[PDB]
Amino acid sequence: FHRKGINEESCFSFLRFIDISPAEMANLMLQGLLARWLALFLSLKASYRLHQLRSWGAPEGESHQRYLRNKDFLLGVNFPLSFPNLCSCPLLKSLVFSSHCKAVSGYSDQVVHQRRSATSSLRRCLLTELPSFLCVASPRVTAVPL
Amino acid sequence: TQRIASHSHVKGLGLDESGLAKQAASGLVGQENAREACGVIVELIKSKKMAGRAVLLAGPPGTGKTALALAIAQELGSKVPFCPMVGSEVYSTEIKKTEVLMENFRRAIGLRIKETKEVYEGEVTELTPCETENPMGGYGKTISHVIIGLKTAKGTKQLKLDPSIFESLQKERVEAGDVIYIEANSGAVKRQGRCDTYATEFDLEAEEYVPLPKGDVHKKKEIIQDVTLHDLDVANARPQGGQDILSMMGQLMKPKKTEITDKLRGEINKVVNKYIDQGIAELVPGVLFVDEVHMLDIECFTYLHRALESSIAPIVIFASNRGNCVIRGTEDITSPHGIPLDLLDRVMIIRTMLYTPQEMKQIIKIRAQTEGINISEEALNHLGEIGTKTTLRYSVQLLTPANLLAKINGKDSIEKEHVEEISELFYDAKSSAKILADQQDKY
Amino acid sequence: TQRIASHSHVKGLGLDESGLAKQAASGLVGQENAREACGVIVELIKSKKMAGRAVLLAGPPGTGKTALALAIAQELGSKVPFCPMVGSEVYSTEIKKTEVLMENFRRAIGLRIKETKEVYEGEVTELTPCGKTISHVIIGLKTAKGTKQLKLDPSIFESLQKERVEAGDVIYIEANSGAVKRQGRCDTYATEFDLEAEEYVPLPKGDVHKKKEIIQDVTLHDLDVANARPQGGQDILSMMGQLMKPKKTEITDKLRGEINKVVNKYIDQGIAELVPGVLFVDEVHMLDIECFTYLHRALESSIAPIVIFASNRGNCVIRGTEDITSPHGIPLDLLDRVMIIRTMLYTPQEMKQIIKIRAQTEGINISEEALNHLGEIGTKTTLRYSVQLLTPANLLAKINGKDSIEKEHVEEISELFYDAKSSAKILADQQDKY
Amino acid sequence: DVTRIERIGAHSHIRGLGLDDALEPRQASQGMVGQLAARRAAGVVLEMIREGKIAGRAVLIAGQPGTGKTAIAMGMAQALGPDTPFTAIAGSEIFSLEMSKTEALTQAFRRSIGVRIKEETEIIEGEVVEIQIDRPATGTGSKVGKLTLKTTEMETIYDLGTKMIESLTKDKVQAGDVITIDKATGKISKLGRSFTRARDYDAMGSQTKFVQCPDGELQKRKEVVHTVSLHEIDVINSRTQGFLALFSGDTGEIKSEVREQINAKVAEWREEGKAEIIPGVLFIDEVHMLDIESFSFLNRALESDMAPVLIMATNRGITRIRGTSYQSPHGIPIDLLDRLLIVSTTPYSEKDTKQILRIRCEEEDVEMSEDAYTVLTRIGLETSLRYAIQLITAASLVCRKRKGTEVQVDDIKRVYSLFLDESRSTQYMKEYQDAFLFN
Amino acid sequence: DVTRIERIGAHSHIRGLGLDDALEPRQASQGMVGQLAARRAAGVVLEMIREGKIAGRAVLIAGQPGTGKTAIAMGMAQALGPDTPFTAIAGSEIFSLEMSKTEALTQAFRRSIGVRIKEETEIIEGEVVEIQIDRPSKVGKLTLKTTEMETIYDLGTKMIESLTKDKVQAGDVITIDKATGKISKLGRSFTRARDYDAMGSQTKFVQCPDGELQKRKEVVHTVSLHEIDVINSRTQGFLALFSGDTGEIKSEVREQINAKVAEWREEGKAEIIPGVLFIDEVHMLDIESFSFLNRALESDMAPVLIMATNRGITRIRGTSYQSPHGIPIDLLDRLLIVSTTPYSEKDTKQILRIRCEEEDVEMSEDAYTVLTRIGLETSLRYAIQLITAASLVCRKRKGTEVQVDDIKRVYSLFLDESRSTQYMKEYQDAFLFN
Ligand SMILES: Nc1ncnc2c1ncn2[C@@H]1O[C@H](COP(=O)(O)OP(=O)(O)O)[C@@H](O)[C@H]1O
Ligand SMILES: Nc1ncnc2c1ncn2[C@@H]1O[C@H](COP(=O)(O)OP(=O)(O)O)[C@@H](O)[C@H]1O
Ligand SMILES: Nc1ncnc2c1ncn2[C@@H]1O[C@H](COP(=O)(O)OP(=O)(O)O)[C@@H](O)[C@H]1O
Numbered sequence A: 001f002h003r004k005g006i007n008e009e010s011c012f013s014f015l016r017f018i019d020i021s022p023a024e025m026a027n028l029m030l031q032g033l034l035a036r037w038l039a040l041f042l043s044l045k046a047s048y049r050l051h052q053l054r055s056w057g058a059p060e061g062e063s064h065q066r067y068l069r070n071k072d073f074l075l076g077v078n079f080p081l082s083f084p085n086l087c088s089c090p091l092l093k094s095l096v097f098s099s100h101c102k103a104v105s106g107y108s109d110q111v112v113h114q115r116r117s118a119t120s121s122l123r124r125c126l127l128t129e130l131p132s133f134l135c136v137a138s139p140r141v142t143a144v145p146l
Numbered sequence B: 001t002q003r004i005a006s007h008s009h010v011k012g013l014g015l016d017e018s019g020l021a022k023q024a025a026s027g028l029v030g031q032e033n034a035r036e037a038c039g040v041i042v043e044l045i046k047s048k049k050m051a052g053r054a055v056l057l058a059g060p061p062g063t064g065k066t067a068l069a070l071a072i073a074q075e076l077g078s079k080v081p082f083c084p085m086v087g088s089e090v091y092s093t094e095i096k097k098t099e100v101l102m103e104n105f106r107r108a109i110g111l112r113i114k115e116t117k118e119v120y121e122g123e124v125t126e127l128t129p130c131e132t133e134n135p136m137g138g139y140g141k142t143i144s145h146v147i148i149g150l151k152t153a154k155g156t157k158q159l160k161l162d163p164s165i166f167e168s169l170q171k172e173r174v175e176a177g178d179v180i181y182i183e184a185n186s187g188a189v190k191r192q193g194r195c196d197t198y199a200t201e202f203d204l205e206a207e208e209y210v211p212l213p214k215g216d217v218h219k220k221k222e223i224i225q226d227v228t229l230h231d232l233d234v235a236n237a238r239p240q241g242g243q244d245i246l247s248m249m250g251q252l253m254k255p256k257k258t259e260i261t262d263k264l265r266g267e268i269n270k271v272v273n274k275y276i277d278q279g280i281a282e283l284v285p286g287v288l289f290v291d292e293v294h295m296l297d298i299e300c301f302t303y304l305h306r307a308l309e310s311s312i313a314p315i316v317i318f319a320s321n322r323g324n325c326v327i328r329g330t331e332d333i334t335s336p337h338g339i340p341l342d343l344l345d346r347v348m349i350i351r352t353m354l355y356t357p358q359e360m361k362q363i364i365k366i367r368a369q370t371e372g373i374n375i376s377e378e379a380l381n382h383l384g385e386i387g388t389k390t391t392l393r394y395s396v397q398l399l400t401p402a403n404l405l406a407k408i409n410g411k412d413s414i415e416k417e418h419v420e421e422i423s424e425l426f427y428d429a430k431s432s433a434k435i436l437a438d439q440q441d442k443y
Numbered sequence C: 001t002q003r004i005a006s007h008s009h010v011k012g013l014g015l016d017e018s019g020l021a022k023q024a025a026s027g028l029v030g031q032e033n034a035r036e037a038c039g040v041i042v043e044l045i046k047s048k049k050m051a052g053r054a055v056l057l058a059g060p061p062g063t064g065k066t067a068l069a070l071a072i073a074q075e076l077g078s079k080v081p082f083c084p085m086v087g088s089e090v091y092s093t094e095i096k097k098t099e100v101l102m103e104n105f106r107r108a109i110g111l112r113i114k115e116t117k118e119v120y121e122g123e124v125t126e127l128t129p130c131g132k133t134i135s136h137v138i139i140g141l142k143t144a145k146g147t148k149q150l151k152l153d154p155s156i157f158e159s160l161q162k163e164r165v166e167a168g169d170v171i172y173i174e175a176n177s178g179a180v181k182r183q184g185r186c187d188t189y190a191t192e193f194d195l196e197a198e199e200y201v202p203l204p205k206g207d208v209h210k211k212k213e214i215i216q217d218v219t220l221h222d223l224d225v226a227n228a229r230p231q232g233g234q235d236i237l238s239m240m241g242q243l244m245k246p247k248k249t250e251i252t253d254k255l256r257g258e259i260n261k262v263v264n265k266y267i268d269q270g271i272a273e274l275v276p277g278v279l280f281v282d283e284v285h286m287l288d289i290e291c292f293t294y295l296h297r298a299l300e301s302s303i304a305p306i307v308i309f310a311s312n313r314g315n316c317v318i319r320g321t322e323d324i325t326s327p328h329g330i331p332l333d334l335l336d337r338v339m340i341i342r343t344m345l346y347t348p349q350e351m352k353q354i355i356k357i358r359a360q361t362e363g364i365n366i367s368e369e370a371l372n373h374l375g376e377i378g379t380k381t382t383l384r385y386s387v388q389l390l391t392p393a394n395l396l397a398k399i400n401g402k403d404s405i406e407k408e409h410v411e412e413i414s415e416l417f418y419d420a421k422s423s424a425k426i427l428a429d430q431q432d433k434y
Numbered sequence D: 001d002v003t004r005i006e007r008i009g010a011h012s013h014i015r016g017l018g019l020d021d022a023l024e025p026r027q028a029s030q031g032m033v034g035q036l037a038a039r040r041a042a043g044v045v046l047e048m049i050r051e052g053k054i055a056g057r058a059v060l061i062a063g064q065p066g067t068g069k070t071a072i073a074m075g076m077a078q079a080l081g082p083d084t085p086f087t088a089i090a091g092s093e094i095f096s097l098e099m100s101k102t103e104a105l106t107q108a109f110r111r112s113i114g115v116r117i118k119e120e121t122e123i124i125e126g127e128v129v130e131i132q133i134d135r136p137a138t139g140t141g142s143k144v145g146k147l148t149l150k151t152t153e154m155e156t157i158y159d160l161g162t163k164m165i166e167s168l169t170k171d172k173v174q175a176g177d178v179i180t181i182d183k184a185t186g187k188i189s190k191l192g193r194s195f196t197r198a199r200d201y202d203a204m205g206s207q208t209k210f211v212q213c214p215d216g217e218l219q220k221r222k223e224v225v226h227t228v229s230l231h232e233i234d235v236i237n238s239r240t241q242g243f244l245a246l247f248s249g250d251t252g253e254i255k256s257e258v259r260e261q262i263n264a265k266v267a268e269w270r271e272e273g274k275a276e277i278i279p280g281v282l283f284i285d286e287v288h289m290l291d292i293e294s295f296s297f298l299n300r301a302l303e304s305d306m307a308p309v310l311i312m313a314t315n316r317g318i319t320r321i322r323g324t325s326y327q328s329p330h331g332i333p334i335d336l337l338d339r340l341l342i343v344s345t346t347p348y349s350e351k352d353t354k355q356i357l358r359i360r361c362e363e364e365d366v367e368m369s370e371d372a373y374t375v376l377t378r379i380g381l382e383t384s385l386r387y388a389i390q391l392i393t394a395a396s397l398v399c400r401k402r403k404g405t406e407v408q409v410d411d412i413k414r415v416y417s418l419f420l421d422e423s424r425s426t427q428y429m430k431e432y433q434d435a436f437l438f439n
Numbered sequence E: 001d002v003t004r005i006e007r008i009g010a011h012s013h014i015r016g017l018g019l020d021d022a023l024e025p026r027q028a029s030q031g032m033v034g035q036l037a038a039r040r041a042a043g044v045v046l047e048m049i050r051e052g053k054i055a056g057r058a059v060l061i062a063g064q065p066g067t068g069k070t071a072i073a074m075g076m077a078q079a080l081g082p083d084t085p086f087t088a089i090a091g092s093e094i095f096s097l098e099m100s101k102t103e104a105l106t107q108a109f110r111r112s113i114g115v116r117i118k119e120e121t122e123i124i125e126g127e128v129v130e131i132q133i134d135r136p137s138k139v140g141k142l143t144l145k146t147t148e149m150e151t152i153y154d155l156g157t158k159m160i161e162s163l164t165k166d167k168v169q170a171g172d173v174i175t176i177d178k179a180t181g182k183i184s185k186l187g188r189s190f191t192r193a194r195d196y197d198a199m200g201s202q203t204k205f206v207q208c209p210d211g212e213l214q215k216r217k218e219v220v221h222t223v224s225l226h227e228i229d230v231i232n233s234r235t236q237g238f239l240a241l242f243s244g245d246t247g248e249i250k251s252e253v254r255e256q257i258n259a260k261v262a263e264w265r266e267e268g269k270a271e272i273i274p275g276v277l278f279i280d281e282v283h284m285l286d287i288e289s290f291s292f293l294n295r296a297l298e299s300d301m302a303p304v305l306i307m308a309t310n311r312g313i314t315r316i317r318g319t320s321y322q323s324p325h326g327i328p329i330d331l332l333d334r335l336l337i338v339s340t341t342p343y344s345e346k347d348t349k350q351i352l353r354i355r356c357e358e359e360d361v362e363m364s365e366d367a368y369t370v371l372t373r374i375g376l377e378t379s380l381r382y383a384i385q386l387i388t389a390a391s392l393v394c395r396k397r398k399g400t401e402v403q404v405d406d407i408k409r410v411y412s413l414f415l416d417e418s419r420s421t422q423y424m425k426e427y428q429d430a431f432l433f434n
């Protein structure tokens, strides 16, 4: 804020266009991984709000077609495939199948046999879970951490 | 105003209905056969039939091979991807060359898919858990639904919602005066904050206020988004979620490119085939332009070998300006254009020739006018002669400094004296090389 | 006591009041021209005015270049920072080659901060807490010289509570840093239980209040490293320092500029002062061509220290080019920037003087005849050979029961150990057998 | 009109090897013409691989450039089938910055031996009528409920335990939905909302597609067939809950002990009759590029009892081996060269080049005159076959530009004059000696 | 007496580019001597940069060693001054181990493009005095104090909770942004620095804010495009700005950045200011990196490149080809060579004078004559370095004015390249490796 001229180079300017406070940045830089983790969690909670604000409210300007508003340097959400947009559009959700908590092999046809009249229906490509039994390996020896 | 680049004037090849090349159209002069061949290539790309076909623009430096690729890009439009590349992008310290090439090949293939967005959004006013008046055996009441009033800059309306949404409302801080939004397809609730209307009831509030929404309470639109096939690869390789120690751990660590396995592509292809067969998404193949191919490696060429005959690879346009040079990665295996012969039999060669002085002068005039510069004929002819003495680039480059010198002297156009002074000041490659040869003992 | 190294016998340049060089002073003899010319460099460093200026020392191996540089380092005292390095240290596996040079350049400039050390210690007599819950806590310290009371802000109270400090423990507190160290329960409560897990210490015999004047030194590179990456903020009681292994990284220029501005501001406020130190490089001929080029830009900067280079190789090929030969393995471009001092060879008189000085420095009594024999054998092969030969003679002489050094001991050692020339001659005759 | 992801490439016409029941190649069948001896040998090795009894067998295909070696490879890949694993790797797809060359070759080898598992589970596909949840007030977190399912013929009511209720809540299942319940694992797959139950609806809380009701009996059996390579089993068992490495490819230099453990476990799995192991084919193309260390690792790795039937390909002559200075045939040291059978290909003639052009035009849907065919064949004999193949599309486009329907000799001559050949480009190249760079 | 972090360097005696209104150089102005044509070309290209209408322009400065290519570049940088980005790097700085030579040049390109943006800022800043809350939605008030007023705010419940979590006490100097509502503690007042005799882990004493309390105004921010790239590179990328941990930013981010910047300039929200990229000692770049500059100078947004080269017709690094300036021909035509000329005797006197007054040194006329003769027979830089030592040697003599004898003494002590090489060959056998 307190500069010696109308036009003078000063760092930390991006702090104004990001939601980071001059105290939040010092905390994030001098506290540690717990502070970083909490800030990350807060950013993934604010991402949905920033997504909607950028995507559905474009009237005129902010200050009558001049200036910039908070969180205008965070353009990572404008992508058509980011998680907020991916959750908003239910079909890209099906186009991004590689979940981080399940074992998906890919797509394979499925055959569903009936019990009456022995009629068998055939299905098209569907997400397939790898069989559980595959995991059989185990280390030879285990050690308590030193 | 947009700043002037080095290829701003190129707006197209300038072809007739019969495909013949005009003498001067769309900022391009001469190279009639090359322009006709590029028009044929444009038709091939628009045909949406072939795959993995390659063309090599071969010619001396400063003859327009780079410009013709941009002309092809401009004539293609903007709904088809066009990925530029140099020969030095493959050499990465994070991932192998044949994966840089594979990722770029997958970049030049784009999708285009349509969907609808439905949302109920606006300011909340009241929450009425409307009950059914007659509880059931063993219970004191039976809530039927929840009445939520939402108002925007257009009007106020009441919506009847499932009772379970109340369980979500208490999960966040859903009080009167906030603005909320609920996705029709998803069904969740999210709070944006208090309205600006109540921004003055205090002097210092920890929360930031958002303006009241303008428009109808229930919005519904249709949007079409375009994603390249490489974006799906990166999206599926690195799942961006927060409810994991793995997702978050990787999102905290330094992000690094990972060699994508071919099994991931095998499933993405299947799913996009299914959705194309269902008529939801439209595939549009594009163009990949490698300039300065002579900087590639023999391993890169040998991978390109197999890469071209694929049924999925896009159309590739190579460009090079080397003579009979040693192939990079070998010892003394010389080859034309620094490209192996076995690869060079899979490409169609387009020859680019030199420029006659008349065409050079026409190019100089076109550059001067596009740049916003006025030049006299007695100076334009001298500049063209100087360029023909040395090269076209050295003639086009002196346009701006001459204009600055004239503006300093106050004149509104360049004369003979300005051009001669600028040429006296700056030097070209040939004279500098002559000076270096003369003064070799003091370098 | 202190182990004796190869450079422990040099104390200074030994220059008189007129700036000339004495024949023998502070452990250095000979090399009159080179030693005297180093005084100009010493005065240049003390002036704290010029920057970037560099110096090269050119001479045959074993002629005193490193000794002269260490004498220069001694002449400046421990106040002036000194950063020694070897050209072979540049090739790292974490950062680029020029980054190491920049880091050493930053290391070769230091700060200076005066302050007062405040020390409290002794037994805790009581802990009394006081917009009403907690404001400050009153603590009572007591030793066997007196008793005092202190007022603590909630941060220090939290630090005490983390150390699991109760009433009746011996505590050490530093007011400046806020450090809290529990030194164990006082001995007077040792009878409270027959078996207690705690350890008991006697009541301190000293002042509760201790004042000192302490002067702290810190180089710029310390500030760059500290502020470059998120400081761990973990000093135990945290498993999050167990995730990411620290690794050396490339410091950006924006940080360095911010650090420069902050240092200017603080030295303008008068809190701290600045000292331009000296960087010293050995095996400079081992620097790659990229490092030699980067030294062109680094040496011409305005915030760079004074650099001294040492090299002994002749007209050898420059590393990284395998085609171009330049004197001292240094490109002509950089070699024109530096200022060159030549180093000569030693006559037998200087040989004998060096041997005698080393012998009296490293604790060996030698007779005149043995000294003459060692001087002759040093003139035969090298200087370092005789200095190496000194110790085994006095190690056998003790075994035989004698104390001094005579002809038989040095002769036996010479017949027992081989120099480089003799071993090379031996290898030639048995060439097909090795 | 619609364009799928698979387009018309250079080998998109070859649908097989074109062999009879007697393994005698035909002159023209299934997109392959000529090259009788190489096709015979390829049929022999294809039958050998189909039998699948001996392991660690290698075959090299050598010949002139543009004589169908890769064509033969694609033909035998298509003839092999989709259910038999086939892996195509270029010569430079192993020099990686994330793992060693030997590790990359080991992964390539283990990626070819597939394991087929038939998984039969009992499922319940039906329409949701109503769901009953009885949350506890305090207690100890025990939940109880009921769930009614209905089809067009039968309906029933099921009780709910403490495990599927959380899954149902996570998937947010309500009335009017059609769901498939997996009895074994317990997952809930969502099909869509029904029609009749949609009449009574609140504001939009779920807007998506529509589906019908599963007819017949409520309980049925489903069957899936999984083909899992050995390499991805290794990756799965190399770390706990590690599955994105199948797609991310982040696992590097897996420990061997895992590899022998997987080998043993696969052996027992084969013995018990649960899963079936099927060897596959590895195709390394342009294999002259492999460093000598890669070849020597291939030596030992080809002697294992789980190695695949790798197929080589080379068009080089007496050339020094990469990374060394020793000359050798095909740029391969004799050690590896002494452990495999070599199949050679012969240069093409006019009669079969004409048929190659004809089948290429049939694939690309291009019509030319017989004189145009003769001119194209003359070009494809004075100049390589690839150039003649490429000129077809350009000639067709030029013909369509003038609103034509049959390609004519004039169009082909125009295209020949427009584009260039390597020989003609080099000829025109010699006259600009000083204009080019680094001659 | 007081020395700042920056002091007298080699290029610190030049302040801007000596020119006229008509771009006519002066014989001696702003610390520059001679090089009239080179300075004219420098002024022309400086005007080209200032206009900032055309993109992707390259200028090369070539000449013999000691002719002032780097001096001209620094004079241009000073004349341009701040507010216009000027990224100066060496040739060997891109050979990193975390990013390829392409990324190390792409980032060096995006770091010379400035974006000016305007922001409306309202901020309250002052020393807290008393905080009062009630227990009935808790209601309270807080009092701020400055040098001019003393005021009370009736803050809301969320502000109560934030203040309780941040643990605000009286005497603290805090700033709040009412647009968002975030507290940024700055420390404690000087007058409140005595109630605790044992300060906590980290506390700072700052003067109380003066002037008006709640300031509302407009500020201008000049941010480089590289910063905008790094911020969106990863989730929390602003750490990499100082850490240097960024590597191989995806190409699908830079295109989005460019599109957004073009949209902003169309809307008038922000304006793009081009800058300069100076690559000193460019004669040692990779043939792979040279080819990358071919397509780097043809983009819509690109700075002006200025290179210096000391090489004549020499081999290109990375290939076995001979070219002028060690640069491929396919790039040299895109450039615009500006040649320099060796200085005359009059230029040599006029250039040593400026350095003498820069170092605050008085020199005699005969001393100037001898120094000019030496600097003509030898390199100019050696003569430039010969004055700093001369001052110290004269100071040792306790004289205020140097003389010819002092210059001769300093000349005899130190050695130049020619005498060092000549003496080196006399006893070259004693040296190592030829
Ligand atoms: N047909 C053309 N019409 C107009 N300008 C041209 C034409 N061909 C080349 N130029 C001009 O020549 C300059 C350099 O050409 P370029 O494409 O870089 O040649 P090369 O690719 O051989 O280096 C460009 O600025 C361009 O404006
Ligand atoms: N003039 C001198 N005065 C005192 N000691 C010397 C002198 N010259 C060399 N030495 C001694 O010689 C030993 C090795 O010489 P050194 O300076 O390391 O050779 P170099 O310059 O090749 O590194 C040092 O321990 C040093 O004490
Ligand atoms: N016997 C054949 N039958 C059908 N097409 C062939 C035959 N031989 C070669 N071709 C065609 O020739 C083209 C080039 O052959 P290619 O695969 O490059 O041979 P190689 O890999 O041995 O150089 C292929 O597109 C292929 O369609």
Ligand SMILES: Nc1ncnc2c1ncn2[C@@H]1O[C@H](COP(=O)(O)OP(=O)(O)O)[C@@H](O)[C@H]1O
Binding pocket: E010, E011, E031, E032, E033, E034, E035, E063, E064, E065, E066, E067, E068, E069, E070, E071, E072, E351, E380, E381, E384
């Ligand atoms: N035109 C000039 N005016 C004043 N001083 C100059 C001029 N040119 C060069 N110098 C001085 O000469 C010294 C060496 O010149 P330098 O720029 O290193 O030569 P080069 O351009 O060959 O590297 C520098 O310290 C610089 O201050």
